[PDB]
Design a protein around this ligand. Structure first.
Ligand SMILES: C=C(C/C=C(/C)CCC=C(C)C)CCC(C)(C)/C=C/CC/C(C)=C\CO[C@H](COP(=O)(O)O[C@H]1O[C@H](C(N)=O)[C@@](C)(O)[C@H](OC(N)=O)[C@H]1O[C@@H]1O[C@H](CO[C@@H]2O[C@H](CO)[C@@H](O)[C@H](O)[C@H]2O)[C@@H](O[C@@H]2O[C@H](C)[C@@H](O[C@@H]3O[C@H](C(=O)NC4=C(O)C=CC4=O)[C@H](O)[C@H](O)[C@H]3O)[C@H](O)[C@H]2NC(C)=O)[C@H](O)[C@H]1NC(C)=O)C(=O)O
Ligand SMILES: *C(=O)[C@@H](NC(=O)[C@H](N)c1ccccc1)[C@@H]1N[C@@H](C(=O)O)C(C)(C)S1
Length: 695
């Protein structure tokens, strides 16, 4: 009868199901989604007898997205007591060794970490890793962070099932519409969805359905990129992974699945709160949660938001730039490990945010800007980078794009050149301080003056005092005698771009326009003791399969002699102690900081190079329109550095003298003496018998 039309239509939709099975299979049995590249900060490893205090550790933990509690229950939490800290270190897929949860007690003895013990067996650790903070993702227009089935708490699955579905066969229906279908309200779509769902549940286990659903679900928007899945939304909304969510935060994310844009907590927080509360009760009907919990959860805010799009634009410019140079875009699930220090960045960002309007008010300024570059003294690894006064939201990066006159910050390269000649130039060497009238080409005289337009009553100064005081006249007399090609060579060795070097007499006093990052490289070279460590933001880039796509190795090259670098830095400590930066030296006398101040003609640029035990901080404070700032090195850029130093626990500079360094006695006349002397200065000699030749 009509079975010639009935059965043929049953075997017509059947072959369509084979095409549908092949479509669902080809996506899952391969690549489900293109997962963006995860960007992680620095990986800190803690060791016994490490120079780190309890308070510094609290700040480090808090900067690593840890929460200070009274009773430790879940990971990413810590408790602080009299002379120790207890913490549950969150699981992390470290490149060296994959680690899980660990209960550790960090014991402190003054300013140092005494011991780190495993609270499971009371065994002392040799080294203890600390997971890196996730900075951002490198963007399809959709952003994800894949977490397998095990990564999700059993409670969160139960929170999702109670609000959504029973699950005994819809949860699998919603999955297929987001994964393969259109946005349409249509009945064809609903039929195509339900038919796909029946094929979906049959060929794949309930664990896989949950794994795919929990990672696909649209839960937010960050401008042009779509925040989807529970793991990324957990970090975007609170700053905690999916494994560390509290029941109230857990319920909000499970609530947004129905309408992420309207149930959003940034815009209309009441509709989001009403929904969260409209989720907590749904769990309450079921025997899973007790009546005791509901009341406290309803009153306590679900958000609790960070609260905020483009994280770390300045530092990210460098990360992207290095990624192209070293290597990538085709690959998915890439983990990029950086050298980013969250503690340093916070200290710097706060200094810029607070300090800039503070200087703008103090000096009645229309506009003022900054640039801060923190690099490791010995590795050149970039710790912090701020490209402005408002660094949370940026497009124009002053640390990398703004090319400005270095001013006096050019002076140590002249004195370093001189001090690389131990038989000729020493700290006690007399340099002439009398009017200069050098004839430049065209027949036009170049007459450089000291800041006060004065000269020494003796017509001379000790090399040490000339750098200490940032005296222009003696600097010119030193560099001209040395030669411009020798000073230009010191700049090449230091690590400044060659194409910026124009060796004219003016180069000695600051006619060298560099960006704060480039200046960092130069000062890093002196601070390390003469070894030039090419600046880097990249530590390692790892693939989804754990393959090492790129690995960072030291490229440190001996640029200047250690003894010459030591003597420049020793004088750079004199700068901060009694010289131009004496305001900083009085504020932090136990830090024995090396530093140099820079002010350009008509107060256009203010600079400060700050060296402590472990970092090199280059800070510039100026205006984009190149107008006078009314600030000096010590008033502008050094003040932002003072703020940066205060916002953290800086390392005291213990300038360990290399070989052939000998503290020698000097008379008023500048002559070496066997015993006594009115001045003690470090000298580069294997045999301090320069005094016998002098006597
Ligand atoms: O089949 C249809 C499908 O029709 P839908 O409307 O898509 O399904 C919704 O209604 C269902 C129902 N039968 O009651 C459901 C309630 O069971 C659905 O919830 C589910 N499946 O679990 C509900 O789907 C949800 O619908 C939301 C949008 O529908 C809104 O529903 C309200 C009440 O039902 C209405 O008042 C709204 O008018 C209606 O819009 C899905 O959220 C949307 O997800 C989209 C991807 C978002 O688009 C983005 O939005 C961004 C943005 O807004 N900013 C950008 O513009 C961006 O460019 C853009 O791509 C979009 O902003 C976002 N809109 C809302 C309100 O959340 C959201 O992604 C989607 N959830 C899932 C798990 O797939 C059906 O079964 O009904
Ligand atoms: C370096 O920046 C030097 N600055 C100047 O010579 C400027 N021409 C100048 C600005 C303002 C007043 C006089 C000169 C020297 N170092 C400065 C500093 O350390 O900040 C300086 C003012 C001591 S002079």
């Amino acid at each position: 009868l009509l079975l010639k039309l009935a059965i043929v239509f049953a075997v017509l939709i059947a072959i369509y199901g084979v095409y549908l099975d092949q479509k669902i299979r080809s996506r899952i049995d391969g690549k489900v989604w293109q997962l963006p590249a995860a960007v992680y900060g620095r990986m800190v490893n803690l060791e016994p007898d490490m120079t780190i205090s309890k308070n510094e550790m609290v700040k480090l933990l808090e900067a690593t997205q840890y929460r200070q509690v009274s009773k430790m229950t879940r990971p990413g939490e810590f408790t602080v007591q009299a002379n120790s800290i207890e913490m549950i270190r969150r699981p992390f897929d470290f490149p060296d060794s994959k680690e899980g949860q660990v209960r550790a007690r960090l014991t402190f003895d003054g300013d140092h970490l005494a011991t780190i013990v495993n609270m499971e067996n009371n065994r002392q650790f040799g080294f203890f890793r600390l997971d890196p903070r996730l900075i951002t993702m490198i963007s399809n227009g959709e952003q994800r962070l894949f977490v397998p089935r095990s990564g999700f708490p059993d409670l969160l699955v139960d929170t999702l099932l109670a609000t959504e579905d029973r699950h005994f066969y819809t949860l699998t229906q919603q999955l297929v519409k987001n994964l393969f279908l259109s946005s349409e309200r249509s009945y064809w779509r609903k039929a195509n969805e339900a038919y796909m769902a029946l094929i979906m549940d049959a060929r794949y286990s309930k664990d896989r359905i949950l794994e795919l659903y929990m990672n696909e679900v649209y839960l937010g928007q960050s401008g042009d990129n779509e925040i989807r899945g529970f793991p990324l939304a957990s970090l975007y909304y609170f700053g905690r992974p999916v494994e560390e969510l509290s029941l109230d935060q857990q319920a909000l994310l499970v609530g947004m699945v129905k309408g992420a844009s309207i149930y959003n907590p940034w815009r209309n927080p009441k509709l989001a709160l009403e929904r969260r509360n409209l989720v907590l009760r749904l769990l309450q009907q079921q025997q899973i949660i007790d009546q005791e919990l509901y009341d406290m959860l309803s009153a306590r805010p679900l958000g609790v938001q960070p609260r905020g799009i483009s994280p770390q634009p300045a530092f990210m410019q460098l990360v992207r730039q290095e990624l192209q140079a070293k290597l990538v875009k085709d690959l998915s699930g890439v983990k990029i490990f950086t050298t980013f220090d969250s503690v340093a960045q916070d200290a710097a960002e706060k200094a810029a945010v607070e300090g800039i309007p503070a200087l703008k008010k103090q000096r009645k300024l229309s506009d003022l800007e900054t640039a801060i570059v923190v690099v490791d003294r010995f590795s050149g690894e970039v710790r912090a980078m701020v490209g402005g006064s408002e660094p949370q939201f940026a497009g124009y990066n002053r640390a990398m794009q703004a090319r400005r006159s270095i001013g006096s910050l050019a002076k140590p390269a002249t004195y370093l050149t001189a001090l690389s000649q131990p038989k000729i130039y020493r700290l006690n060497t007399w340099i002439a301080d009398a009017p200069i009238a050098l004839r430049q080409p065209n027949g036009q005289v170049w007459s450089p003056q000291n800041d006060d337009r004065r000269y020494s009553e003796s017509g001379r100064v000790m090399l040490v005092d000339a750098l200490t005081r940032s005296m222009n006249v003696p600097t010119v007399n030193l560099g001209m005698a040395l030669g411009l090609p020798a000073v230009t060579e010191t700049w090449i060795k230091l690590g400044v771009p060659k194409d910026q070097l124009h060796p004219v007499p003016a180069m000695l006093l600051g006619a060298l326009n560099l960006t704060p990052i480039e200046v960092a490289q130069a000062f890093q070279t002196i601070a390390s003791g003469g070894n030039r460590a090419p600046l880097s933001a990249l530590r390692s880039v790892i693939a989804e399969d754990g393959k090492v796509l790129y690995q960072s190795f030291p490229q440190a090259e001996r640029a200047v002699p250690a003894q010459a670098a030591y003597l420049t830095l020793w004088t750079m400590q004199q700068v901060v102690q009694r010289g131009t930066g004496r305001q900083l030296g009085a504020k932090y006398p136990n830090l024995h900081l090396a530093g140099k101040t820079g002010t350009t003609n008509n107060n256009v640029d203010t600079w400060f190079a700050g060296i402590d035990g472990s970092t090199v901080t280059i800070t510039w404070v100026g205006r984009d329109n190149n107008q006078p700032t009314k600030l000096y090195g010590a008033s502008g850029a050094m003040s932002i550095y003072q703020r940066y130093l205060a916002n953290q626990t800086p390392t005291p500079l213990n300038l360990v003298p290399p070989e052939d360094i000998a503290d020698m006695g000097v008379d008023y006349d500048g002559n070496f003496v066997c015993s006594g002397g009115m001045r003690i200065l470090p000298v580069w000699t294997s045999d301090p018998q320069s005094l016998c030749q002098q006597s």
